[PDB]
Amino acid sequence: ELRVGLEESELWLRFKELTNEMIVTKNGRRMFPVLKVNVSGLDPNAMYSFLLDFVAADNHRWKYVNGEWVPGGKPEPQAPSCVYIHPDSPNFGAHWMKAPVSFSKVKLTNKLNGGGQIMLNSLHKYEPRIHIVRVGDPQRMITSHCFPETQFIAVTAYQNEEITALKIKYN
Ligand SMILES: C[C@@H](CO)Nc1ncc(Cl)cc1F
């Protein structure tokens, strides 16, 4: 059976407890924690690409008021569909399964200024999603996994001082 497991799930849960925030900038900002997954049940002999995108969680935006995240108004129109290709792509099943797959280099941005960055709307909540794409497949088989522990609100600046502190503590 294909199994894609979240690495460092208890680290993600420490952030999710506070409501996780990721900074978006013009030139793009790397995530902490980094999304890392373990993989079993691929064909070790087959070739696959790993893709990452971010799914909008809500039909509204958020705002931080009196130390609480609350519904913050109607959403901005959906960010353009940005997909990040894991740089090891394409590679053998054996490659993806021998050690956790790390998306350490993906950058989150609030400006369409290229560089393979992911555009997100500030004060909107997103859920990372990984796609495994089989190479040379006439059926173009794709598998998609979502990671609920990794949900975060995109921000231009940290709202929760506990997130500011946690980001310093664990990074
Ligand atoms: C939070 C802590 C709980 O034992 N777990 C982790 N902490 C930090 C790193 Cl670098 C990775 C982890 F997996």
Swiss-Prot record:
Known tissue expression: Detected in testis, but not in other, normal tissues. Detected in lung tumors (at protein level).
Domain of life: Eukaryota
Annotated region of DNA binding: 11-171
Subcellular location: Nucleus
Coiled coil: none
Disorder noted: Neural tube defects: Congenital malformations of the central nervous system and adjacent structures related to defective neural tube closure during the first trimester of pregnancy. Failure of neural tube closure can occur at any level of the embryonic axis. Common NTD forms include anencephaly, myelomeningocele and spina bifida, which result from the failure of fusion in the cranial and spinal region of the neural tube. NTDs have a multifactorial etiology encompassing both genetic and environmental components. Chordoma: Rare, clinically malignant tumors derived from notochordal remnants. They occur along the length of the spinal axis, predominantly in the sphenooccipital, vertebral and sacrococcygeal regions. They are characterized by slow growth, local destruction of bone, extension into adjacent soft tissues and rarely, distant metastatic spread.
Primary role: Involved in the transcriptional regulation of genes required for mesoderm formation and differentiation. Binds to a palindromic T site 5'-TTCACACCTAGGTGTGAA-3' DNA sequence and activates gene transcription when bound to such a site.
Assembly and interaction partners: Monomer.
The protein's name in its UniProt record: T-box transcription factor T
